[PDB]
């Protein structure tokens with residue numbers, strides 16, 4: 001505290017604090033006849049002393065401090081977000097008082113003299129008070145008097161006060177509680193309850209205690225966001241440093257506890273050096289509760305009875321300190337927003353310490369406390385299923401915490417009601433198809449957060465959702481089979497689209513830091529072992545593959561011999577993210593587009609800045625293993641040249657998102673994505689359309705890009721490529737990878753190239769092989785550049801320069817100013833000898849494939865190696881073809897004529913929904929030539945032809961096997 005007024009223009013953001021850790025500390029204070037003030041060192045919040053105020057009923061003391069109270073506008077301009085001037089303090093009652101403390105503000109007040117507020121005094125321990133001076137009083141520039149007036153209707157009493165403060169605070173976070181009414185309130189949890197109720201029986205009580213034990217087992221037997229500490233020496237040393245001591249007639253003294261979000265009220269960056277030094281003695285709650293949790297785990301595992309006893313005493317003393325510091329029911333502490341970051345491991349520690357809390361008589365207080373602070377999470381904790389219940393962040397950061405809270409409920413019947421309701425809640429959350437872009441699982445196996453498929457968020461949700469189902473398994477509280485089934489689909493999907501990292505196109509705002517299925521491994525074991533008929537051999541086989549365990553290891557784990565899964569093979573469509581996966585031997589190809597329902601990229605203030613082309617009809621090839629080891633290196637990466645994309649090559653200043661903060665650029669039509677045939681073959685259809693008027697986006701940049709994938713190969717074709725500038729700098733990238741000693745060789749037309757730098761130009765009938773064993777045969781292009789070169793780039797978070805050596809090849813479309821095009825073919829198992837054979841087949845009247853149509857309405861590719869035909873109907877059309885005659889909607893159709901059968905698949909990758917609306921099925925009429933008889937697809941012979949009726953729900957292909965009618 002300084003001679004300056006509160007909210008002084010020298011530094012408006014500089015808090016004034018009466019902590020009394022200074023020379024002459026009651027200088028600014030005056031008491032009437034019926035009040036006495038002293039410093040006590042018995043307890044304190046900031047510094048070693050607090051103000052002891054002995055009073056008779058209705059007496060006052062006054063703090064003489066000039067306040068230049070800012071407007072909310074002024075406070076907000078001074079900090080840079082919505083703000084208000086706040087008055088705050090802490091007070092301690094050793095005994096409850098049946099009445100109100102009155103705080104008045106005005107000019108030259110004495111005992112007997114504008115605006116003010118009430119604090120209810122019916123409590124013990126520390127409480128915080130915090131009000132907006134502009135919004136929460138019932139303030140003229142002349143205020144110099146803050147009068148603290150004891151209750152009238154109570155004849156005498158005693159209150160400790162510390163850390164009287166004037167500060168600028170976030171205008172969201174002065175919360176009402178049982179002591180003070182503010183303009184803001186976070187209402188208490190109101191638990192939902194499902195009927196019929198399970199009875200309290202020995203069996204249902206035993207099931208509840210088993211679930212608690214199963215949770216203990218998971219936390220004492222490797223968690224992200226848990227700073228595990230198993231060394232007891234270190235735990236004792238961190239605990240002793242808290243300087244906690246029990247006080248004679250109750251409470252503790254010890255270092256003040258504060259959350260990471262509570263510190264904002266001080267404006268720590270602007271504190272005077274004297275206050276900063278006292279503020280620096282605080283303990284961050286997250287660290288404290290992590291310590292409580294590490295002690296609780298140590299205590300469960302401890303075999304030495306003396307140490308075990310000490311570890312319990314440390315946990316219970318930490319608990320007593322936390323409660324006396326005011327972390328109790330009906331105590332807002334001004335705010336506790338983002339509560340989970342501060343308390344997640346407190347919830348869990350209560351499971352481990354549940355008998356110790358019972359015996360110590362703390363269980364009711366800790367339950368009441370945690371329930372009150374959980375009110376932030378009311379939309380999930382109330383357990384009424386809603387469109388928002390499938391929240392993937394909840395599954396990661398809160399679900400086990402929610403269960404822990406319920407299990408801490410002291411009444412047996414209410415506990416069983418809560419966990420029965422919890423089981424129904426989780427079943428509905430994991431079953432329902434949320435509408436529009438709301439978080440959660442989807443029917444093609446995608447899993448959404450931030451309004452799209454998002455592995456970076458779904459992977460931790462899968463881990464902890466599987467674990468929850470496993471914790472509840474084989475009890476009256478087990479998750480419904482519908483939730484198990486839906487989660488299995490999402491987790492088998494993740495196994496298919498990861499190798500073991502998800503490709504660059506699925507990286508979200510974290511390109512080159514893809515999530516890995518390795519982090520989700522245990523979830524596969526948990527889901528396998530929680531099947532109705534356990535173990536689920538598919539999920540068990542995947543757990544062994546991802547965790548690198550042998551068949552020999554399987555019996556001990558699953559209780560039967562299970563062969564580790566081989567890598568999935570074939571083609572899988574995932575229109576939830578307008579992608580598909582082609583798998584052959586150990587390679588995965590992520591084919592990815594975007595549309596109205598699928599954002600191209602997520603770009604934040606400091607993430608993915610150059611991600612514009614993340615979904616530009618990419619086809620990233622990944623062999624099983626580290627993407628970085630395969631040359632997907634961020635340093636020097638040309639962000640223009642994402643593999644398979646057609647792009648405008650831009651300077652990074654122009655490729656950077658034009659929004660300073662967030663851009664999730666959606667596409668201009670519903671249709672773009674993939675389809676599948678027989679689980680083996682795929683097609684991508686990508687209609688590249690830019691916005692009419694978004695800065696840095698050329699409104700005339702267009703392309704039609706199709707890919708047909710089968711067996712060891714993919715056929716890429718493009719047409720109708722254009723830009724505002726005659727295709728200047730318009731390119732299609734074949735590949736890009738870093739050059740390293742293990743990734744040092746290219747082949748071009750049978751010649752090994754290792755020189756750096758190196759450039760050359762290829763055309764139709766030429767071929768290359770990248771260092772990853774991918775062959776590229778150029779089948780229609782006038783100009784294909786190949787480069788081995790030093791590149792300069794910038795990192796996707798802070799735009800800081802980077803550099804690296806790269807091999808790349810791209811098609812230069814500037815040779816064709818209007819309606820540029822390309823064709824090329826990729827061989828996944830290329831060798832120089834096989835590429836020689838493929839080039840010869842191409843020269844033999846193209847024995848590889850045939851493009852039957854390549855225009856703005858339809859692309860049709862006949863694959864002569866696989867005998868499969870893909871039809872990308874960018875527009876409904878009638879066509880001339882042996883099999884397909886007409887399609888009445890934008891669609892992807894595929895055919896395979898084998899022996900006595902024609903197999904036809906159809907879909908629209910359009911999910912037929914909005915950010916708000918549920919997806920509804922699209923009916924597609926596909927007329928095929930000739931008379932056929934035969935799947936949910938309906939058919940009807942109509943003259944010489946056969947009408948097939950497909951139902952495309954959420955971009956999920958359907959297929960039918962037809963045979964010819966005489």
Ligand SMILES: CC(=O)N[C@@H]1[C@@H](O[C@@H]2OC(C(=O)O)=C[C@H](O)[C@H]2O)[C@@H](OS(=O)(=O)O)[C@@H](CO)O[C@H]1O
Nearest residue numbers: 392393394397439449450451457603604605661662
């Ligand atoms: C603020 C912003 O850019 N985006 C909001 C999301 O915030 C990010 O994502 C998450 C997250 O857990 O999903 C946490 C961090 O705040 C941000 O990295 C997110 O907001 S929220 O979860 O923080 O409330 C979503 C909520 O659906 O909204 C984005 O706008």
Ligand SMILES: CC(=O)N[C@@H]1[C@@H](O[C@@H]2OC(C(=O)O)=C[C@H](O)[C@H]2O)[C@@H](OS(=O)(=O)O)[C@@H](CO)O[C@H]1O
Nearest residue numbers: 224225396397455456457460508509510513514515
């Ligand atoms: C999409 C996303 O940001 N997910 C969050 C995680 O972030 C990814 O994983 C990690 C990681 O090692 O945790 C780091 C990178 O930020 C991302 O690759 C992760 O967030 S954070 O704590 O790492 O900032 C988790 C933490 O709860 O939240 C993810 O889901």
Ligand SMILES: CC(=O)N[C@@H]1[C@@H](O[C@@H]2OC(C(=O)O)=C[C@H](O)[C@H]2O)[C@@H](OS(=O)(=O)O)[C@@H](CO)O[C@H]1O
Nearest residue numbers: 450451599603604605659660661662663664665666
């Ligand atoms: C003006 C407008 O609607 N812009 C849209 C964005 O929303 C704004 O920006 C952000 C931000 O994090 O940058 C948050 C607020 O919602 C708005 O101030 C944003 O839409 S959304 O994702 O927030 O729904 C983007 C997504 O591309 O669309 C903006 O341009």
Ligand SMILES: [Mg+2]
Nearest residue numbers: 019046047049
């Ligand atoms: Mg003090």
